[PDB]
Amino acid sequence: RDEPWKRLPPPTVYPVKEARFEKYIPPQLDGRERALAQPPGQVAIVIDNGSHSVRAGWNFEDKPRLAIPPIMSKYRDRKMGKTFSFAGSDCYAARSHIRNAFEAGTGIVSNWDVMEHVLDYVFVKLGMNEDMPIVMTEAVANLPYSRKSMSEIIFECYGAPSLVYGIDSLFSFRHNQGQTGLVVSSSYSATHVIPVYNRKALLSQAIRLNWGGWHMAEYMLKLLKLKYYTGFPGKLNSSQTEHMVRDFCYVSLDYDRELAGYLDWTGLEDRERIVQYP
Amino acid sequence: EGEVTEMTPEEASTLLIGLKSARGQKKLRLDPSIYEAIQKERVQVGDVIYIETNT
Amino acid sequence: AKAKTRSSRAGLQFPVGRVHRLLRKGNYAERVGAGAPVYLAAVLEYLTAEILELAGNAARDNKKTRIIPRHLQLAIRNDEELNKLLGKVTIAQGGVLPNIQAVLLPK
Amino acid sequence: AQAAHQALVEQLDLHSIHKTFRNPNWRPNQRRNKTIKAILGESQTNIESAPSLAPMKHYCDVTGLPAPYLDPKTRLRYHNKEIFAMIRNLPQGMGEQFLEARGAHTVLK
Amino acid sequence: XXXXXXXXDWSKSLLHAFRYGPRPFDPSSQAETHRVHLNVERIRVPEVLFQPAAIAGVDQAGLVEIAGDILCQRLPSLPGIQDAPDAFLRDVFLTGGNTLFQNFDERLRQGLMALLPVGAPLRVRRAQDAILDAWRGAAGWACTEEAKAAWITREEYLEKGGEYIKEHDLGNAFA
Amino acid sequence: VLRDNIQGITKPAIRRLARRGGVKRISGLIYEETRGVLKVFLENVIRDAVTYTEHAKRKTVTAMDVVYALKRQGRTLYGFGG
Amino acid sequence: RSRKESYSVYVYKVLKQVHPDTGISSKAMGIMNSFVNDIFERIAGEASRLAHYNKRSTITSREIQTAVRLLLPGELAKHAVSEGTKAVTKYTSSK
Amino acid sequence: RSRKESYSVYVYKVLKQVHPDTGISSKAMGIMNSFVNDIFERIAGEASRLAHYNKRSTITSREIQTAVRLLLPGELAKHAVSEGTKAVTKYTSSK
Numbered sequence A: 001r002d003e004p005w006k007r008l009p010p011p012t013v014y015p016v017k018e019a020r021f022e023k024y025i026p027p028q029l030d031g032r033e034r035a036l037a038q039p040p041g042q043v044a045i046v047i048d049n050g051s052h053s054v055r056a057g058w059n060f061e062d063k064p065r066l067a068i069p070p071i072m073s074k075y076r077d078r079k080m081g082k083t084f085s086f087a088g089s090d091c092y093a094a095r096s097h098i099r100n101a102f103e104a105g106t107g108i109v110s111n112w113d114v115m116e117h118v119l120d121y122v123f124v125k126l127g128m129n130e131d132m133p134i135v136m137t138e139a140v141a142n143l144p145y146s147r148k149s150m151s152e153i154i155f156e157c158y159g160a161p162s163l164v165y166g167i168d169s170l171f172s173f174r175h176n177q178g179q180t181g182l183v184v185s186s187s188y189s190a191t192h193v194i195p196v197y198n199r200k201a202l203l204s205q206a207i208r209l210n211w212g213g214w215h216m217a218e219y220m221l222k223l224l225k226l227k228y229y230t231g232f233p234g235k236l237n238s239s240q241t242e243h244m245v246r247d248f249c250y251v252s253l254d255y256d257r258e259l260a261g262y263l264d265w266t267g268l269e270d271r272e273r274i275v276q277y278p
Numbered sequence B: 001e002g003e004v005t006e007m008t009p010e011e012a013s014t015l016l017i018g019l020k021s022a023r024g025q026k027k028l029r030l031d032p033s034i035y036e037a038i039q040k041e042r043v044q045v046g047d048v049i050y051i052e053t054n055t
Numbered sequence C: 001a002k003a004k005t006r007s008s009r010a011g012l013q014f015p016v017g018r019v020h021r022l023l024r025k026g027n028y029a030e031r032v033g034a035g036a037p038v039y040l041a042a043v044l045e046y047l048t049a050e051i052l053e054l055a056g057n058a059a060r061d062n063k064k065t066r067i068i069p070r071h072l073q074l075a076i077r078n079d080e081e082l083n084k085l086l087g088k089v090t091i092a093q094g095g096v097l098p099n100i101q102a103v104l105l106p107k
Numbered sequence D: 001a002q003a004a005h006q007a008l009v010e011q012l013d014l015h016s017i018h019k020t021f022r023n024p025n026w027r028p029n030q031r032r033n034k035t036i037k038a039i040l041g042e043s044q045t046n047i048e049s050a051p052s053l054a055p056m057k058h059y060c061d062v063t064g065l066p067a068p069y070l071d072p073k074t075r076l077r078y079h080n081k082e083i084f085a086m087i088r089n090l091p092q093g094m095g096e097q098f099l100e101a102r103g104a105h106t107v108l109k
Numbered sequence E: 001x002x003x004x005x006x007x008x009d010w011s012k013s014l015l016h017a018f019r020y021g022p023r024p025f026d027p028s029s030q031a032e033t034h035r036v037h038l039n040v041e042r043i044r045v046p047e048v049l050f051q052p053a054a055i056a057g058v059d060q061a062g063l064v065e066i067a068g069d070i071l072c073q074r075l076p077s078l079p080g081i082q083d084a085p086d087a088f089l090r091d092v093f094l095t096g097g098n099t100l101f102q103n104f105d106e107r108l109r110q111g112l113m114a115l116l117p118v119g120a121p122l123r124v125r126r127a128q129d130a131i132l133d134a135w136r137g138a139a140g141w142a143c144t145e146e147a148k149a150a151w152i153t154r155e156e157y158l159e160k161g162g163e164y165i166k167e168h169d170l171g172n173a174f175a
Numbered sequence F: 001v002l003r004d005n006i007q008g009i010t011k012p013a014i015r016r017l018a019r020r021g022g023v024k025r026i027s028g029l030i031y032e033e034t035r036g037v038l039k040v041f042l043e044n045v046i047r048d049a050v051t052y053t054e055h056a057k058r059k060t061v062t063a064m065d066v067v068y069a070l071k072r073q074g075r076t077l078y079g080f081g082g
Numbered sequence G, H: 001r002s003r004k005e006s007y008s009v010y011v012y013k014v015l016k017q018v019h020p021d022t023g024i025s026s027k028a029m030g031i032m033n034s035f036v037n038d039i040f041e042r043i044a045g046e047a048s049r050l051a052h053y054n055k056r057s058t059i060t061s062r063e064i065q066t067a068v069r070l071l072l073p074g075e076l077a078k079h080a081v082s083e084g085t086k087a088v089t090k091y092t093s094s095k
C-alpha cells in the first residue's frame, strides 16, 4: 500500500527562533530633557523587575524604554589585556559566561552582583549624568532579606530620593480599571491567584502555583531530550524550546478526548509541527 | 442528573445533597423518606444519580 | 527505646550490621557510607537466592529433598552468567556436567 | 574582517563609560548570593503554596497518551506493547531519566 | 506468506508516528536528520497548569482547583465582606505573560462553571497588553497621592532601618 | 551514528596480524571470525571503561579507565599509567 | 569457647524463602558460605579500588553499585542492582 | 599541575648504575614506572592479605618477605629476599 504517503503534501516547515542579539546601541538622552521640563512631584522612573524581562522607563509615557533580560557577562582577554563586562541584551544569548540575577525557578533576587550591573546598565542607557523617585516591582510575599538588600543597593550604591515596592500583577489590575475580582496571573516564575476586594489585595490568602514559563521551557527541553532518544545531532538550548512553546502550544478544551485519539494516522499531517536546524 | 458532591445530614432527618453537573452544582433538600430510598441504593460519595423530584 | 535491626529496616535477611563491621575493619577505606552495607547485603542475598533456587530445582530432579554439592554444581555450570562468575572456582564434591562428544558416540 | 566584530565588542561595554553616579564610598559585602534554604535558615510568607488531595489521572511517561498500567521492573506507565518493547530493551541509564522527568527519581545519595 | 499472497513495517507502529510522523523514515540526509517533530508536546506542556500532579509530578493543585478552593471554601468563610459569589465573579481576568495561549480563558471558564453554583454571572476576560500592563499600572500609579503617602525617603531608610514597609494596598504585609 | 565500521578492520590488516603471529596460510572465513572476536573483545573492554568513566562522573573516557578495565579483565597494560 | 561467625542461619532463611520443602547438606552449606565470602571480598575490593581511583576516602552505595556492574555479568547484574536499589530505598524511607 | 610524581629519577639512577653509557626513551620509562607500581601493589596486597589471615594488624618486613616468596618465581625470589635482608640490615646499622 503506497496510499498513505503518495498524495501527502510537501511539508511546511518552521525554522528555529533562538533568542539572539539585535543590532542596537542607543544612548537615549531625549528622556531626561522631557523629564526635567515637567513640574516636580510628577516625575518618576518606573522599573518592572521582571524575571524574564526587566523593563524600565519614565512614568509620563506609554511604552517602556528598556526591556532587557537580567543576563550579564564579564571577561578578561589576555590576548588583548583588557577586562570586559557587558550586560543585558548585549550578550548574544559568541562567548557566554552568563549568570542571571534571578534564581532559576523562583522570582526572588539572590544574585546581587548581577542585579547591580543590570541596574547599572539601566541607569546608563536611560541617561544619568549627575535623583528621581523609583517605582519598582517585586514578587508576592517576598523574602525580607531580598528587600533589604535591594533597598541597600538603591540607597547606598546609586543614591535615590525615594523608592516604593509593589506587586506588578496588581498594578496591571489597577490599570485595567477593576475594583473587585480574582486576579489570576501566570508569570515567568510562578502563577499567582490573588483575590482583590475594593481595590485592596487580600494577601493573607493568595495562593501561588509553583509552575511558570521557565518550567514550561525546562519541561519541554526534558521531553525533547527523552523523545529523540538515540541522540539528536543538535544543540538543545532552553531558550529555543521556550520559543517553541511560545508559538506551538495551546491548552486543549477537552483534554482526555483530544489526547487519546491524537496520534491516529488519519490527519496527523495537520497536527504535527516540524522544526528545522542548520 | 448529576454527581453527588456531599451527603450532609442537617438535623438530628433532612439531608442536603449537592448535585454537581458539568454546568454547575446545586443544593437540594431531601425529605426523610426519599433519603431512605437513596440509602437503600449504594450511593456513597461521588456517584452520579438520577432523582425524580415529583415521583 | 525499642531497638530494631538494620536488616529489618532494609527488608533483607542478610546481616547489615555485620557487613558494615567487616567493611570497616576489612581495610577497604577510611570511611564507609551508610548505603554500602544495605546495598552489599542485598546483592549477596539476591545471588544466594538465585543459586539456591536452581539448586533446589536440580535437587528436585534427582528426587532428593536435601541440596548437595552436586546440585550446586549442576546449578552453576548450566547458568552461563553464574558459570562465568565462578569460572575460576572449583566446587568440592560437585563432579562435572554429563557431556559426551558426538564423535565418541556409537556408529 | 573581524574589525566590525571587535568594534561591536568594544562599544558594548560598561567599563568603557565612566560611572558618573556610582558612590565610591560603598563597599560590597561577601555574605550575599545565598539560596532560599539559607535565607529561610536566617529567619528561623512564602508558605502559601498548597498541595492537593484528589485522584490523579495517570498518563504515559514515554509518550503522552493515556496509559492505564505500569511495570514491576522499571515502574513506567505505558500505553501498549510497542512501548513495552521499547521499555524492556532500552539502554541503561535512561529508565531512571524518565522518572527524573516525571519526578520522584530518588537518586542514590 | 509469498505463496499465500501470490495465492491470494513502520506504518503499523505508533512510535514512528510519534517521533517522525506519517511520512516515511529518515534516510540520514542533510536536512532530514536535523528535524524535531512535535505532536503531543503541543497539548501536554501547557496542560500542567491544570493537572500538575500527574503530568510533571509537581505535588500541588491545579489552577481550576485553586480557584475553586478560594471562591467556594475560603471567601464565604471570611468575615468583613458582603457577597462572596456575587462580587468576585464579576471580573476574573488573566494578567501574566504565560497566558497568551489559544483557548486558555475558556478552559478556566469551563472549570469554574463546573465548580460554581448555577446562575453565577461568571465573565472571564483578559488584560489588554498582558506583558506590558504590569509596567503601565505602576506608571499610572507612580505620581499620585497614595504613592506620595507611601514613599520611603532616604532619612526614613537611615532611621527606620532596611526592612521598613509602608503598608500600601498593593504591596505586601507590613513587618 | 555512522554506518558499519566492522569492515574497517580490513583484510590486509588481519593478514598482517597473522603474519606477526606467525601464520603462513590464512583461510577466507578467518577474517569475519576475527572481526567477530575483536568486536566481542572491544565490547567487553569498552563497557567496563565507560563504567569507570561514569562512576567518576566524567563525559570523557580517559586512558586510565582503559588501563583499569584491562587490569580487572586480567590483561595488564604498561606504558599509560597505573 | 571462642565463637566463630558464619552465614549459615542467613542462607538457611533464604533457603526457606525460596524452597520451603527442601533441605541442605553441611558440605553445601560450607560451599555457600565460602561463596558469599568470596563475592563479598570481590565487591568490597573493587569498591575499594574505585574509591582509591577517584581520591575518595569513603565507600558509599555508588561505589558498590559500580562494582556490581563491573563484576556480575548481564541480567544477573541488572537484577542485583534492582534488589540493591530497592533495599537501600526501603532502608532510606523506614528510619 | 598538582605535581604528578613517579619513579622516574630512581629508575634513571639504577639504569646509570647497571649501564653508565645507556639511555632510555620516554615510553620505556613509563613502562618501567608501571612495572614498579604493579609489583608494589601486588606485594603490598599479598602482604595485606597475609597480615589479615593471621589476625595481625601490622605489615612488617616478614609479611613483605613472605609475599616476595609467594610472588616472585624461582631465583628471582631468592636474590630479591637477599637484597632485602641486606637492606634492612644496613638500615639497622645507622638508625
Ligand SMILES: Nc1ncnc2c1ncn2[C@@H]1O[C@H](COP(=O)(O)OP(=O)(O)OP(=O)(O)O)[C@@H](O)[C@H]1O
Binding pocket: A049, A050, A051, A052, A053, A107, A168, A187, A188, A189, A190, A213, A214, A242, A245, A246, A247, E096, E097, E098, E099, E100, E101, E130, E131, E134
Ligand atoms: N505570544 C505569546 N504567546 C505565548 N506566550 C508568550 C507570548 N509572549 C510571551 N509569552 C510568555 O510570557 C513569558 C514572559 O512573561 P513576563 O516576562 O511578563 O513574566 P514576568 O512579569 O517577568 O514574571 P515575574 O513577574 O515573575 O517576573 C515568557 O515565558 C513567554 O513564554
